[PDB]
C-alpha cells in the first residue's frame, strides 16, 4: 500500500510515454525512447501482481558509476615491512582476479617495499562493470601470518589500506588545472637535461586548493606520466564529492588469518575457510555476498 504507490506511477508513466512514441517525432527521440526501454521491465511486472513467489520488484534503486572503469591503490600501514609485503599479496590477488575475467590491469605508480613490498601501488583496471564490483574492496585489510623472518613461529598482525575510486571519462574532466596545482619532480635533486639519464621518468601533482596529491612513474615519456597523473588527480577529486555524501558499506573491512586459513568480512559477518582461494584471485565468494547484502539495505 506504500510501494505500490510507485508502480501506479510508473505503469502510468510508461503508458504515458508509450504514446508520445507514436506521433510525428524526430531529434532526441533517443532519450525518450530509451526511457521506454526502461519503464518496460518495471511496468511488465506491476501489470501482473494485478493480473494475478511474487518476485519483489528490486528494479527501483538505480546506480551510476557502477560500469565505469576503476583506479585501485594499495597502501601499507600498521606492521613493519611485513605490511608492505602484504600490499604485494593483496595487489596480486586483485590482478589475478582482474585477469580471470579479462580486465585491463595497468600500474601507474609503485613504491618498492623498503625490503620487498609496496608502500603504494596503483593500477588502472578496465572492463565493464568494474567500479560497481570492487568498490566494496575499499577500506582496510588486515593480515595475521607467521613471517618467514620469524622461526619461533608467532603470528604477526600487520595491515593495508585500499582505495577504489572510479574511472571518469578523461573526456569529462573539469580542466581543474590553471595554476591551482603544483607539478613537481621525484628526483630528490639532479642536474637533469643532458648531464643525466635515468631509465624512467617520475612526475608528481599537488592540488593547491583541496591539497590532493597524485604522482606517477614508469619507463615512458614524462608527457605521458603527467597527463596520466592529471587523470588520477581528477579521479581523486571526484573521490571527494562522493565521500562528502553523508550501514553505508582505514576501517577494518576484512582480516586474513593464515594459521587458520580464513578470511572474514567484518562488514557482513561472513567468514569463509577459503583463504587459499581468495589469495589466488577468487574474490567473488566475497564480492557477491557483500553485494546482495548492500542490496537488501537499499530495499528499505
Amino acid at each position: 500500500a506504500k510501494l505500490e504507490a510507485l508502480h501506479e506511477r510508473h505503469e502510468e508513466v510508461q503508458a504515458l510515454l508509450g504514446d508520445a512514441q507514436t506521433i510525428a517525432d524526430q531529434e532526441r527521440f533517443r532519450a525518450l525512447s530509451r526511457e521506454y526501454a526502461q519503464l518496460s521491465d518495471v511496468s511488465r511486472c506491476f501489470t501482473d501482481w494485478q493480473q494475478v513467489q511474487q518476485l519483489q520488484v528490486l528494479l527501483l534503486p538505480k546506480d551510476p558509476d557502477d560500469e565505469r572503469n576503476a583506479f585501485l591503490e594499495v597502501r601499507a600501514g600498521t606492521g613493519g615491512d611485513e605490511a608492505a609485503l602484504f600490499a604485494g599479496d593483496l595487489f596480486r590477488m586483485y590482478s589475478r582476479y582482474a585477469e580471470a575475467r579479462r580486465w585491463r590491469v595497468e600500474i601507474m605508480s609503485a613504491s618498492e617495499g623498503e625490503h620487498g613490498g609496496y608502500k603504494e601501488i596503483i593500477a588502472k583496471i578496465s572492463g565493464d562493470g568494474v567500479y560497481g564490483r570492487l568498490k566494496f574492496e575499499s577500506g582496510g585489510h588486515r593480515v595475521q601470518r607467521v613471517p618467514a623472518t620469524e622461526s619461533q613461529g608467532r603470528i604477526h598482525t600487520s595491515a593495508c589500506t585500499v582505495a577504489v575510486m572510479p574511472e571518469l571519462p578523461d573526456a569529462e574532466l573539469p580542466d581543474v588545472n590553471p595554476a591551482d596545482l603544483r607539478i613537481d619532480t621525484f628526483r630528490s635533486s639532479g642536474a637533469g637535461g643532458q648531464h643525466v639519464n635515468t631509465t624512467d621518468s617520475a612526475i608528481r601533482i599537488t592540488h593547491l586548493p583541496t591539497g590532493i596529491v597524485v604522482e606517477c612513474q614508469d619507463e615512458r615519456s614524462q608527457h605521458k606520466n603527467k597527463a596520466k597523473a592529471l587523470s588520477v588527480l581528477g579521479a581523486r577529486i571526484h573521490a571527494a564529492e562522493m565521500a562528502k555524501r553523508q550501514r553505508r558499506n582505514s576501517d577494518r573491512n576484512r582480516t586474513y588469518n593464515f594459521p587458520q586459513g580464513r578470511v572474514t568480512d567484518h562488514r557482513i559477518n561472513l567468514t569463509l575457510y577459503r583463504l587459499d582461494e581468495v589469495m589466488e584471485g577468487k574474490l567473488d565468494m566475497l564480492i557477491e555476498p557483500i553485494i546482495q547484502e548492500h542490496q537488501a539495505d537499499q530495499l528499505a
Binding site: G192, Q194, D200
Partner: protein, 276 residues
C-alpha cells in the same frame, strides 16, 4: 627458469643501478613480451631457452652500464615512441619542457619551424605533431642522426616534417622560420657527470660543446639572427648552471624579450628570446 626467479637473480647482480627492479622488469618484459603486471601477477612462468639466453646478453651489457633505452632501443617523448641509438642522445624529459615553452610562442597562423641538432627527432616530431599546419625542418650534423630521425618520422607517420644534414645552417642557406628551436650540446668537455651514469655510453658529438660546454649555444644565438622572421623567437636548452650565462649572450647578441623558463626538476632549462 621463473620470471620471478630471473627478476630476483638479475636485481642482485644489478645493485650498481639507480633502479634495479625497474631495469630488471623492463628487460624481462622486452624479451618475453609480457607487461609489468603480468610478470608480477604470474611469476611462475618458465622462460624458453632463447629468452633466458637473450635476457642474459642484455643483462651483461646493463651491468657494464649500457643504458636501458640503448638495450631495448626505444624511448617515449611527448607520448610519442622514438627509436634511439648511441648515434645521438636519448631524448630527455626536461627537453619536453623546451617543446612546451615553444608551443605557446608559436604564431596562431600556420608557419615554418627549424630544429637545430634534432637528433632522434624528438622536439621536431612532437611539434609537427601538435601543429600539423606547420612545416618543421630538422637538421643534424651526424649523418646517422639524420637517419634515426627519418626512421622515426616514417614509423610515426608524421609528414609535415623534413630532415636534412647541415652543420647548424650550412644547408639552410637562405631560409627564415617563424620559430627556431634547439637543444645543442652544452656539457663541458670535462664535467664530472660525463664521468658517471648512462651518459658514459652516449656520444660526445651530442654531449660536448666547447668553451667549457658553452661554444655551440652561443654560436647559434649568433647565427640564428640572420634566419628569424620579424620578431620570431629563438629558444635553446642549456645546462642547469648556464642560467644567467645564456641569458646574457642572448642580451648581448641583441635579443628582445629574453627569459628563462624552468623545468619540473625545478632547474633552469630553456632560455628564450626574440629578434628584430
Amino acid at each position: 627458469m621463473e620470471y620471478q626467479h630471473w627478476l630476483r637473480e638479475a636485481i642482485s647482480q644489478l645493485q650498481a643501478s639507480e633502479s634495479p627492479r625497474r631495469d630488471a622488469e623492463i628487460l624481462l618484459e622486452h624479451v618475453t613480451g609480457r607487461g609489468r603486471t603480468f610478470i608480477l601477477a604470474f611469476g611462475e612462468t618458465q622462460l624458453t631457452d632463447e629468452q633466458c639466453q637473450q635476457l642474459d646478453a642484455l643483462l651483461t651489457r646493463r651491468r657494464d652500464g649500457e643504458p636501458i633505452a640503448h638495450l631495448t632501443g626505444v624511448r617515449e617523448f611527448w607520448s610519442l615512441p622514438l627509436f634511439v641509438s648511441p648515434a645521438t642522445l636519448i631524448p630527455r624529459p626536461d627537453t619536453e619542457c623546451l617543446v612546451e615553452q615553444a608551443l605557446a610562442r608559436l604564431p596562431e597562423q600556420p608557419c615554418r619551424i627549424l630544429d637545430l641538432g634534432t637528433g632522434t627527432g624528438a622536439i621536431a616530431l612532437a611539434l609537427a605533431s601538435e601543429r600539423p599546419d606547420c612545416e618543421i625542418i630538422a637538421v643534424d650534423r651526424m649523418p646517422d642522426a639524420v637517419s634515426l630521425a627519418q626512421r622515426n618520422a616514417q614509423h610515426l607517420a608524421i609528414k609535415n616534417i623534413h630532415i636534412l644534414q647541415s652543420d647548424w645552417f650550412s644547408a639552410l642557406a637562405g631560409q627564415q622560420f617563424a620559430m627556431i628551436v634547439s637543444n645543442p650540446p652544452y656539457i663541458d668537455e670535462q664535467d664530472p657527470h660525463l664521468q658517471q651514469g648512462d651518459v658514459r655510453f652516449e656520444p660526445l658529438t651530442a654531449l660536448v660543446a666547447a668553451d667549457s660546454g658553452m661554444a655551440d649555444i652561443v654560436h647559434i644565438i649568433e647565427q640564428s639572427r640572420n634566419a628569424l622572421v620579424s620578431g620570431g623567437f629563438l629558444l635553446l636548452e642549456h645546462g642547469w648552471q648556464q642560467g644567467e650565462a645564456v641569458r646574457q649572450a642572448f642580451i648581448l647578441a641583441g635579443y628582445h624579450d629574453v627569459e628563462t623558463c624552468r623545468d619540473y626538476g625545478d632547474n633552469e632549462r630553456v632560455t628564450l628570446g626574440r629578434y628584430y
